[PDB]
Design an enzyme around this catalytic site. Structure first.
Site, PDB file in Angstrom:
ATOM      1  N   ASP A  91       0.603  -1.250  -0.008  1.00 43.71           N
ATOM      2  CA  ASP A  91       0.118  -0.145   0.012  1.00 43.71           C
ATOM      3  C   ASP A  91       0.772   1.212  -0.103  1.00 43.71           C
ATOM      4  O   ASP A  91       1.847   1.504   0.822  1.00 43.71           O
ATOM      5  CB  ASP A  91      -0.751   0.166   1.185  1.00 43.71           C
ATOM      6  N   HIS A 103      -3.458  -0.875  -2.388  1.00 42.50           N
ATOM      7  CA  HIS A 103      -4.320  -0.440  -1.591  1.00 42.50           C
ATOM      8  C   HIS A 103      -5.413  -0.865  -1.167  1.00 42.50           C
ATOM      9  O   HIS A 103      -6.180  -0.944  -0.148  1.00 42.50           O
ATOM     10  CB  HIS A 103      -4.915   1.079  -2.146  1.00 42.50           C
TER      11      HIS A 103
END
Length: 251
Positions: free
Chosen positions: A199, A227
């Site tokens: 992420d 993400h």
């Protein structure tokens, strides 16, 4: 005892964003929910409609009320701020907490403490960069002048792009300012952090800092993800979800 699992969207998203996963958790025998929060349904008023967190989170509390037994609250990204708030107001009704690369703040700490620049290991400079204030500052909206950049940072997970039924246009700044009010029974509730190692919205360094800064133990699972884990590994995520709702304390 754990009948229901509730999946909760992050900033500028909708419950639909979880569609790859809802059937996979239905398979393991749970009743699976992916509500839209207040202001997250087109034609429900929009970002300005949301008074506070009790009002933002009411659609989940409604579900939690109608549950037959216990429930599991998962939150994504800013969604972590919601399940923390709810845990404190429905600790009877929830049997575990999943923070999927989510914002987890110690009691009394607001989510902006980690969104904003700070020491140590605090802030999300990519996300602030692509998310701008609107409406004299009481909503946030993406920066559509940089669409591919938006995709690389937030939608990288999607194979291949995400559908329109997944996002909204502007997001209320209410969950950003409201501190975590967890206390008492609320803190008893088991806690697990699924962290996306790749992420770059909420970087792994910030993810761990929050676990560390949070008083009490947080169980941890780690996905090699961007993400959104749900887009790129719904199975792997679904499994680690349903293993937690099978036995939250031991897990």
């Amino acid at each position: 005892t754990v009948t229901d699992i509730i999946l909760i969207h992050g900033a500028l998203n909708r419950g639909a964003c979880y569609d790859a996963v809802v059937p996979l958790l239905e398979a393991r025998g749970y009743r699976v929910h992916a509500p839209d929060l207040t202001g997250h349904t087109p034609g429900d008023g929009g970002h300005l409609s949301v008074v506070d967190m009790e009002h933002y989170t009411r659609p989940v509390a409604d579900i939690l009320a109608r549950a037959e037994g216990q429930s599991i609250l998962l939150g994504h990204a800013l969604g972590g701020a919601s399940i923390s708030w709810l845990a404190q107001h429905h600790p009877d009704k929830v049997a575990g907490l999943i923070y999927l690369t989510a914002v987890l703040t110690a009691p009394g700490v607001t989510p902006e403490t980690f969104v904003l620049p700070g020491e140590p290991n605090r802030g999300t400079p990519h996300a602030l960069d692509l998310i701008q204030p609107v409406d004299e500052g009481r909503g946030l909206q993406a920066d559509f002048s940089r669409l591919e950049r938006l995709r690389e940072v937030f939608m990288g997970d999607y194979p291949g792009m995400p559908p329109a039924e997944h996002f909204i246009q502007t997001q209320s700044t209410v969950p950003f300012g409201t501190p975590n009010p967890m206390e008492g029974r609320a803190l008893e509730i088991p806690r697990l952090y699924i962290e996306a190692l790749d992420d770059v919205v909420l970087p792994i360094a910030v993810q761990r800092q929050m676990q560390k800064e949070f008083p009490g133990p947080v169980a941890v699972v780690s996905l090699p993800a961007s993400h959104a884990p749900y887009y790129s590994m719904p199975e792997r995520l679904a499994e680690a979800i349903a293993d937690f709702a099978d036995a939250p304390a031991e897990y």
